[model samples]
Target: LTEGNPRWEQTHLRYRIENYTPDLPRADVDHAIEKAFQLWSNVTPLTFTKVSEGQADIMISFVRGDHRDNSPFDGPGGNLAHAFQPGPGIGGDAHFDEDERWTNNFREYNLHRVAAHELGHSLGLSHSTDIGALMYPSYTFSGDVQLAQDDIDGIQAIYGRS
Candidate 1:
């Protein structure tokens, strides 16, 4: 929900890739994630960095069935992925449903599209009613995923302009 729009106390954030899916190349996985984070950073003062060790603000990973987040993913189709709001602990973590095929292109569940959406959630954005918005609750694959004006407003409202 855009209700709270919970945000981090700082602008500079870090992310960690907990694990990878065999469906796509490891390089592609990182590329998708890197590009996903860039979508937000491009519009706001926020910045994201990748970390291989220690703590990070965002933790990206893939899991199947139950991943112990209480909200278990239903195979592949039901939920592509989900992310928590800004905070400590499990906060700002994005989890992908591993049962589904993750691809670099427009193949079903595109990592970049879904990851950007979930990362919008990571940055405290709720599902948007704005058609074609990044947080529009559904993945609409076309080409390079772009952030809608509504999305820019939501994030910029919290983090302000870059």
Candidate 2:
């Protein structure tokens, strides 16, 4: 739980998509990632930009089994994805399990929802007790996906209102 320990230290942040999963179309995956970032930007003063090459504040990738970083991912089901808190190097990077069938719709594991939640971690947020919050540990599918007010308040506490 990063909470208030450390933040981006800047309003504008950049991200890089290292790879994509074949479970969903490339465009859908890109859109989902973009929308996930927008979910936080809409409430906080933070902004995100996509980078094709070079170092980015947040680096997103898909991997299966053990891909270094010590925290080897389980095949599937158990751990969907994980992200690091804001900082340098491995910090702010997100890794999604490629073994899982990532989806865009309300199917088994929705990439958008999980990505948004992971991005919350990338932005220095921790799991919230509020079930409605995106930072909640457990994943639950909602009709329309949107950040809970608890999420907004938590983010605002760090970055303030938009």
Models, CA RMSD each: 2.2, 2.1
Residues 1-162, model 1: lDDT tens digits: 454556898898999999999999999999999998988998888988999989999998899888888989999698889999998899999999999999888679888899989999889989999877988987798887899999999989888986
Model 2 TM-score on a 0 to 1 scale? 0.96
* lDDT assessment of candidate 2: 0.92
Off by over 4 Å in 1: 1-3
Per-residue lDDT tens digits for candidate 2, residues 28-57, read 999999999999999988889999999799
Clashing pairs in model 1, backbone N/Cα/C closer than 3 A: none
Off by over 4 Å in 2: 1-4
lDDT of 2 at 31: 94
> Candidate 2: minimum summed lDDT over ten consecutive residues — where?
1-10
Give every collision pair in model 2.
none
Highest lDDT: give the candidate number.
2
